[PDB]
Amino acid sequence: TQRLANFLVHSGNNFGAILSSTNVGSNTY
Amino acid sequence: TQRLANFLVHSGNNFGAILSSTNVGSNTY
Amino acid sequence: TQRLANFLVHSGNNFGAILSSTNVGSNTY
Amino acid sequence: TQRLANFLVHSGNNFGAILSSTNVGSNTY
Amino acid sequence: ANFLVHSGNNFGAILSSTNVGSNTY
Amino acid sequence: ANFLVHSGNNFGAILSSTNVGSNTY
Amino acid sequence: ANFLVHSGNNFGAILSSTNVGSNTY
Amino acid sequence: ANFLVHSGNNFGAILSSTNVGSNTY
Amino acid sequence: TQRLANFLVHSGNNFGAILSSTNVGSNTY
Amino acid sequence: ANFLVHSGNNFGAILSSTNVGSNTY
Amino acid sequence: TQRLANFLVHSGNNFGAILSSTNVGSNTY
Amino acid sequence: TQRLANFLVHSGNNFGAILSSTNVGSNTY
Amino acid sequence: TQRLANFLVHSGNNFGAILSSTNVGSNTY
Amino acid sequence: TQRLANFLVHSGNNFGAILSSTNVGSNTY
Amino acid sequence: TQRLANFLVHSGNNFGAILSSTNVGSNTY
Amino acid sequence: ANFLVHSGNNFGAILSSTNVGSNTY
Amino acid sequence: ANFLVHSGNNFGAILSSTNVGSNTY
Amino acid sequence: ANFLVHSGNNFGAILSSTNVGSNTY
Amino acid sequence: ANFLVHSGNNFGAILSSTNVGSNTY
Amino acid sequence: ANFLVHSGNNFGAILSSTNVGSNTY
């Protein structure tokens, strides 16, 4: 089992998320 | 089982998510 | 079993999601 | 079993989702 | 075997704008 | 075997606008 | 064998607009 | 075997703008 | 089982997250 | 085996702007 | 506009979800 | 606008979720 | 706008989540 | 705008989470 | 805007989390 | 006006079993 | 006006079992 | 106006079991 | 106005068991 | 106005058990 992945990203201005995992709760009780 | 993937992204201005996983709850009790 | 995938995206301004998985709850009890 | 897929997307302004999976609950009890 | 090539140009410009890309999580 | 080539130009421009792309999660 | 080629131009422009692309999740 | 090549130009410019990319988590 | 991954990112101005995992609570009781 | 090559140019410039990228966690 | 809801659940053994919202991606690129 | 909700749950053994919101990504690139 | 909610839970053994919000990424690149 | 919430939980043995928000990444690059 | 919340929890043995926010990374590069 | 009453008994028992309720998310 | 009453008994018992409720997230 | 009353009994018992409630996040 | 009342009994007992509630985060 | 009252009994007992509630963060 061989798994090959290639990522090439070009960003000028990044205000959000790139190749990122974000967890937020923002819960109210 | 061989799995090959290639990603090439060009972004000028990113305000959202690129190649990203986001989790939000925003729940109310 | 060989699986080959190629992705090429060009984005000027991204306000949403590109190649992304989003989970939101937004539930009310 | 060989499966080949090619994706080429050109976007000027993205406010929604491109090649993305979105889950929202928006449930009320 | 798989080969990928790319030789292009991308351009995105936001000009003279206000309240751009405000997000809340 | 699979080959992919691309040699193009992309352009996206937002000009003189207000309240663009406001998102809430 | 499969080959894909592309040599084109794309253009998207939003001009002089308000309250564009407001989303709520 | 797999090979990947790239020789392009990317450009993103935000000019004369206010309240750009305000985020809250 | 061989797994090979290559990441090449070019960023001019980064105000968000690149190749990062973010956890926030923002909960209210 | 896998090979990766890259020879390009990237450019991002924010000019004459105010309240850019304000974030709160 | 008045909305009244009453929930009464009796469970012996719960292996799944009760009054719950679940989001899973399980996506492959 | 009045909204009234009452929840009464009796659980012996809970292995899953009760009155809960779950987000999982489980994504593969 | 009046919103009233009452929660009454009785649990013997809890191995999962009760009135809880969970976020997991479990992502692979 | 008046919002009133009452929570009454009885737990014998708690091995999971009660009225809790959990964030986990578990990501692999 | 008046917001009133009442919490009453009875726990015999707590091995997990009660009214708590937990953040874990567990990431691998 | 709405009234709800309940005065019953519930019972669920798993006995002498293996590999019960295995879940994967 | 709404009234809710309950006066019942609940019972759940797992006995002499193995590999019960294994979860993975 | 809303009223809630409860006067009941709950019972959950795990006996003589192995590998119960193993979770991984 | 809202009123809440409760007068009940809760019971949870794990007896003669091994490897109970093993969690990993 | 809101009032809350409670007058009950809670009981949780782990007896004659091994490797109970092992957690790792």
Curated annotation (Swiss-Prot), chains A, B, C, D, I, K, L, M, N, O:
Modified how: Amyloid fibrils are degraded by insulin-degrading enzyme IDE.
Modified positions (Tyrosine amide) are 29
Listed transmembrane segments: none
What is the annotated localization of this protein? Secreted
Q: What else is known?
A: IAPP is the peptide subunit of amyloid found in pancreatic islets of type 2 diabetic patients and in insulinomas.
Report quaternary structure and partners: Can form homodimers. Interacts with IDE and INS. Interaction with INS inhibits homodimerization and fibril formation.
The Swiss-Prot or TrEMBL record describes its family as follows: Belongs to the calcitonin family.
* Full protein name: Islet amyloid polypeptide
The organism of origin for this protein: Homo sapiens
Q: Which residues of the full protein are shown?
A: 42 to 70 of 89
